[PDB]
Design a protein around this ligand. Sequence first.
Ligand SMILES: Cc1ncc(NC(=O)c2cccc(C(F)(F)F)c2)cc1-c1cnc(OC2CCOCC2)c(N2CCOCC2)c1
Length: 269
Amino acid sequence: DWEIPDGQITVGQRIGSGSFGTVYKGKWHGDVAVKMLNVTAPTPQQLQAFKNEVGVLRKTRHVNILLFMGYSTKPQLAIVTQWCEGSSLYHHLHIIETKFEMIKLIDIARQTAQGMDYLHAKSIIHRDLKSNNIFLHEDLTVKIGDFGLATVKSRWSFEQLSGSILWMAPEVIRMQDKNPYSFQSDVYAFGIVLYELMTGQLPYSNINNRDQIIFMVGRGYLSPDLSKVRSNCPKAMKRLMAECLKKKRDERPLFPQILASIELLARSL
Ligand SMILES: Cc1ncc(NC(=O)c2cccc(C(F)(F)F)c2)cc1-c1cnc(OC2CCOCC2)c(N2CCOCC2)c1
């Protein structure tokens, strides 16, 4: 099974922490990432939140999904994943401002679409897809993860997630539908990731008020500016972006179509 016996993991450098967990770099048959719960004696809800996450990760076996490696219960409840040298797509695009070639931007898009197509086939709705959750292993291979460390009521069980408003579909901002999170809300988030790749920027860079952005997207008054895409961005890519970013969720394509469209436009370059 996937349970790792006590004393096998060497916990190293602390990377970060939030209200729910703390991530460390470690050693277990090579470099690993270790995410521990902040409490040693968890409540029935905290333990259920932990088991829910292990439950989703253990269903994944795909090169574009962060490789789950096992979990521990002793001395603490922890999740073990592969350790990746590299940086998140967010870090590359918006912090160090890496200038990838169009061919590589399309390659990153194709790889993300593969991982998302895989998750949706396993009935997993991510609910927090964004460039921060796309890791570039050796600055080349996409590893989709969920790197948030904050307490979330029913994360892998539902309720609205915050701090990722730029990637939030209009119906996710509103919270008026019977089921606001869907494969289509993940597709909208993916449409924002495509915008980040093709422009090198975060949407709505010219609006300095976050509350106004939330209000406007939800009302359907604001959409990303597609004329900001790089001069050599293929027309088929700009077309795909507009379909993913549709205000009405029913008008959005699903990942089998998205992946087929990227595979086809990557051939024509
Ligand atoms: C340890 C761990 N255990 C469980 C999860 N869970 C998930 O991903 C997860 C949970 C549920 C569903 C899914 C879905 F995507 F499949 F839908 C994924 C994440 C991490 C972890 C947190 N934070 C990290 O790094 C920080 C953030 C990046 O930048 C560096 C600091 C890493 N890395 C790994 C690469 O190598 C550098 C360190 C892994």
